[PDB]
């Protein structure tokens, strides 16, 4: 009965304000308030919105950074990737509305809908100092996302996961064994907004034998699950050299943490989107419900993603190196230094393997 | 009964977050949401007012993060964002964070030197810490700048204005004013105004909706004015631009206001609490409101620079021209006088 | 690229000893791991 607190505000709420609001508008403004402030990845779904929850979008992945909306990252096959919208940016206006405080929940609701349907986003960048309007059009574009390309005159491969959905173990597996004579990997994950955790410790499950994967623990004593690697690792001893950037989150760095604590990789690149939590949509009334965080899942260590990111082993920044057809040609390596730093790295482990044989 | 709604929802959240949250730590969270859910003005108070500057690092300048209302030293007079020089004579081009606050701040009602350099002044002014009128050169037409409606401005203003009895037209410069009480904007007003309706509080109840009339003695009935306003205008420097507007008694010159027509009538809630809304807002005399759509100059120009070929100097006018437009405005206002007489 | 003992001074101004150091960070990795 420690409702007396709140009793006392809301009584004198409803009696001295400018407008007619009920009883009912007032708390439904408290419980929209109170879950958006408890954290920024909280929103509630009222009568009408939980009904229709249960297509198409621009593609942009949204999360909030110190209190402000970013963008973590554009999929490449998305029109908002083509458009120009570019990781790091805050978002300032979405047709023509403010966005001063709304959830992710909404906001994917406002890119989502029908596709072929114009959406005009405000967008305000670091290198801009005025805000730039931006007009995408709708698409359904299916592409794939995990592909292997070998790199010419080297043993190592390049497996791009630009998206963490479903079936990406057995492409990758699959990948991987069509090159049997390969001696190396370059995992690039920058720019990957995330995806599904069953299949995250699914392609880790490749490279490390035994070993906690991913812990997920809340304050309870019970739900916290444990992901454990299994003994049918194939893969126990090829070289790896996973590239991250501040694009990467939410899986992007169970499969960089992972490797990185069990020193099965080598992490390279800038500092991850430091972005890892457990979201779900518990029913608390006839037809609504709350959707708030509960559990996050810590690096197989102990330590947490969230908010702290994955620090890679080696730390550089896009550019061009100094130099004086299915296929990873010379020529694009050059353009971008940390995929040359992430063949470097593979280089070495090597040598190493070659002494140590 | 009425709580059904809330008491489901808090005890889900007590239960399944991340981290574990008393009921009293999730009232306060519920409680400081609701109030910013209904208005952005309205804010609850923890400890509220009864119960001092911080200094830190943007840009690799020194910037205020955020004022005391109850510190003495802002009646003071010391101002925030000039170049500071000397601070009880220690240098500023080098100082910490434990510096700054052990050595700007200290007990009150002590003397203590500072010296501040600014821009307009050719020497630096010695401050030590324990609205008006200027002729325009050339021009029969004077300058009331106010840069707050605090207290005792109508008295100070009244009274500049009986030191020039040659007046012949004011520009009543009300750019980047935030506002202040009230009662002493609608006296104000009442200078200029011989009759009709200032403005007017009202509510969602009949009882408590205010009114304001102006009385017979208005001193300065027929003296021509032309207001500047801009979008740092808000509250009380609103409630002058339009009741003159209203009252076709000035001529508003300058950009929209941002509308801050609204009442924050603060009162305890609990034993060392407190909350804030919005209670009345305010209607200009025709009957529109301030909130949020602020006041549409007459005549609409934006900050610039005009093309080339104790007092305001003509070199002064000709940095914004805004000012130069109020005075064009005057001298319209004198030739149709002259006409008509 | 940009965002009596060796600080990270001088580390920045050639890109060849900063390329050493991080092979032999990759180094220390692979003996971690066979170890």
Redesign the interface.
């Known amino acids: 009965h420690?409702?007396s607190?709140?009793?006392?505000?809301?009584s004198?709420?409803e009696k001295?304000?400018?407008?007619?609001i009920s009883?009912?508008e007032?708390?439904?403004?408290?419980?929209?308030?109170?879950?958006?402030?408890?954290?920024a990845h909280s929103a509630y779904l009222n009568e009408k919105k939980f009904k229709e929850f249960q297509f198409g979008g621009l593609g942009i992945t949204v999360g909030m950074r110190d209190g402000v909306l970013t963008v973590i990252a554009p999929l490449e096959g998305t029109p908002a990737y083509k458009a120009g919208v570019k990781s790091g940016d805050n978002i300032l206006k979405i047709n023509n509305e403010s966005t001063l405080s709304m959830s992710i929940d909404d906001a994917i609701n406002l890119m989502r809908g029908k596709p072929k349907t114009p959406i005009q986003i405000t967008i305000v960048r670091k290198n801009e100092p005025k805000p730039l309007v931006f007009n995408i059009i709708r698409d359904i574009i299916k592409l794939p996302s995990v592909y292997v390309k070998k790199i010419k005159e080297t043993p190592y491969l390049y497996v791009r996961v630009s998206g963490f959905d479903k079936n990406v173990t057995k492409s990758v597996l699959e990948g991987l064994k069509a090159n049997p004579k390969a001696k190396g990997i370059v995992l690039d994950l920058r720019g990957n907004p995330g995806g599904l955790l069953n299949q995250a410790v699914g392609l880790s499950n490749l490279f490390i034998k035994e070993g906690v994967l991913v812990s997920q623990k809340?304050?309870?004593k019970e739900e916290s699950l444990e992901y454990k690697a299994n003994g049918r690792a194939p893969y126990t001893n090829l070289?790896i050299a996973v590239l991250v950037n501040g694009g990467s989150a939410s899986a992007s760095e169970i499969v960089a943490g992972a490797l990185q604590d069990?020193?099965?990789a080598?992490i390279i690149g800038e500092k991850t989107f430091g972005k890892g939590?457990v979201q779900m949509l518990?029913p608390?009334?006839k037809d609504?419900a709350?959707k708030?965080?509960?559990?996050?899942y810590y690096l197989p260590s102990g330590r947490t993603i969230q908010a702290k990111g994955i620090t890679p082993?080696?730390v550089?920044?896009?550019?061009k190196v100094?130099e004086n057809e299915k296929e990873v040609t010379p020529k694009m390596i050059n353009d971008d230094?940390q995929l040359k730093?992430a063949i470097?790295?593979l280089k070495?482990?090597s040598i190493?393997?070659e002494k140590?044989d």
């Open positions: 420690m409702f607190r709140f009793s006392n505000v809301v004198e709420i001295k304000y400018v407008d007619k009883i009912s007032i708390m439904t403004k408290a419980i929209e308030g109170l879950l958006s402030n408890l954290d809340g304050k309870n070289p069990h020193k099965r080598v939590s518990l608390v009334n609504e709350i708030i965080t509960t559990a996050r082993d080696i550089i920044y896009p550019g100094p230094i730093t470097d790295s070495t482990w190493v393997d140590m």
